[PDB]
Amino acid sequence: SGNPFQANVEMKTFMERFNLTHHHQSGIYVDLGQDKEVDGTLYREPAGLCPIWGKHIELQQPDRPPYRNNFLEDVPTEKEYKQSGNPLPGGFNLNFVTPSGQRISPFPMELLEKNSNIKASTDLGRCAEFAFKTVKATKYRYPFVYDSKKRLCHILAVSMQLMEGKKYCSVKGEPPDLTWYCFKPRKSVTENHHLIYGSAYVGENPDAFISKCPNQALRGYRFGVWKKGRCLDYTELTDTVIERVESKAQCWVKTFENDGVASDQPLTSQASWNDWWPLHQSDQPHSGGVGRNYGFYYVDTTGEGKCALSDQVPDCLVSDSAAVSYTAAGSLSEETPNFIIPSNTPPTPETALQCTADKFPDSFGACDVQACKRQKTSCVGGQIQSTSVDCTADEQNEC
Numbered sequence: 339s340g341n342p343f344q345a346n347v348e349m350k351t352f353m354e355r356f357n358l359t360h361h362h363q364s365g366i367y368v369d370l371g372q373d374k375e376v377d378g379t380l381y382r383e384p385a386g387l388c389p390i391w392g393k394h395i396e397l398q399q400p401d402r403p404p405y406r407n408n409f410l411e412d413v414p415t416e417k418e419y420k421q422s423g424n425p426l427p428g429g430f431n432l433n434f435v436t437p438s439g440q441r442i443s444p445f446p447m448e449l450l451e452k453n454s455n456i457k458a459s460t461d462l463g464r465c466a467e468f469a470f471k472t473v474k475a476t477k478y479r480y481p482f483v484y485d486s487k488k489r490l491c492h493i494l495a496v497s498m499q500l501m502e503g504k505k506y507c508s509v510k511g512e513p514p515d516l517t518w519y520c521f522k523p524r525k526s527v528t529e530n531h532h533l534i535y536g537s538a539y540v541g542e543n544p545d546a547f548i549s550k551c552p553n554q555a556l557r558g559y560r561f562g563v564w565k566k567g568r569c570l571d572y573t574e575l576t577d578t579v580i581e582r583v584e585s586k587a588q589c590w591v592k593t594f595e596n597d598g599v600a601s602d603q604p605l606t607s608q609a610s611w612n613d614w615w616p617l618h619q620s621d622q623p624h625s626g627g628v629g630r631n632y633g634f635y636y637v638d639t640t641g642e643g644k645c646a647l648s649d650q651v652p653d654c655l656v657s658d659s660a661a662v663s664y665t666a667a668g669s670l671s672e673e674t675p676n677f678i679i680p681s682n683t684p685p686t687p688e689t690a691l692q693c694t695a696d697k698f699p700d701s702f703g704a705c706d707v708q709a710c711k712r713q714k715t716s717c718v719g720g721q722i723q724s725t726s727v728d729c730t731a732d733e734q735n736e737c
């Protein structure tokens with residue numbers, strides 16, 4: 339009878355957007371899928387094509403001045419690090435100033451929107467284009483953070499994303515001998531949803547991410563894989579991790595902070611006070627975006643908020659009007675926000691899940707005799723429905 343989310347061009351192109359292995363093509367928790375040579379040494383470089391919503395690097399600095407514990411503060415100056423002693427004060431922000439003595443980052447969006455050289459149609463893409471178009475003279479492309487609330491575009495001099503261990507870096511000052519404070523990738527239930535992280539390469543095709551990335555939570559559907567002639571949401575799969583959550587927010591954080599998330603990160607040196615970029619290592623992994631990136635919040639039959647998490651690139655959806663499907667790349671929110679909608683170039687449709695009952699009639703599958711359930715695909719108040727129901731009484735003789 340067919341997988342309905344595949345028996346259509348419109349469906350296909352739409353299910354493709356959640357496929358992070360396809361367009362994003364790189365680590366999400368850590369993103370370092372490319373190499374680039376600078377001053378004769380080979381460094382890792384972020385390369386993912388998709389923007390990562392809510393992602394910030396949490397620092398672990400001492401809780402005393404001069405330490406701000408915010409990665410959007412400037413990379414420190416030599417003088418500032420002379421004054422502070424170990425570990426480094428400051429944040430990850432590029433702090434270069436042009437010859438004119440004008441400042442690179444953070445850079446105002448109002449300036450970008452009125453620049454012809456900036457050919458992107460959306461504010462997020464403009465920042466991205468700017469990241470991509472601006473790097474004593476190198477070919478390295480810094481990753482960037484768009485502060486979408488302050489409309490400032492940040493270029494990040496530091497590409498490192500994760501450092502831990504008493505062998506590498508200090509935590510809150512301890513041990514006190516270490517040059518670097520530790521830091522990791524974070525997503526928070528409450529903090530910083532308005533920051534967007536990305537490799538420069540989001541900017542090469544500054545409009546592409548609009549339809550090739552899973553930017554938003556998908557409200558009212560669970561990620562699923564087509565099997566045994568029906569859509570199996572992750573709960574029905576053996577490889578899936580399921581964790582009890584208190585709010586749909588924790589689930590979303592989990593799709594990004596779980597152990598299996600696409601990660602391009604066992605370092606082999608104490609970074610110098612000045613090494614803003616990971617070194618290329620012989621055995622470095624490139625995830626390509628393969629990972630436990632996918633997940634949804636649902637409530638089970640007993641009233642519990644749960645969180646299914648899978649590494650299976652989904653190819654069908656199970657309707658569940660309470661559910662929200664998250665990935666590592668996109669936002670908690672499910673509303674297209676103003677900064678990825680052209681300022682004007684008409685918007686690109688996703689009508690892939692709109693329907694009428696007349697042109698979209700109840701279609702039933704054959705009986706999965708192992709689960710004694712069958713696919714039913716319908717249209718209810720203008721939206722596609724996809725669930726696994728009871729077989730007929732007849733078919734039941736076979737389970």
Ligand SMILES: *[C@@H]1O[C@H](CO)[C@@H](O)[C@H](O)[C@H]1NC(C)=O
Pocket residue numbers: 357358359360361651652653
């Ligand atoms: C996702 O994309 C990759 C590479 O483009 C592909 O090999 C894989 O089959 C895709 N997974 C799907 C469509 O479920």
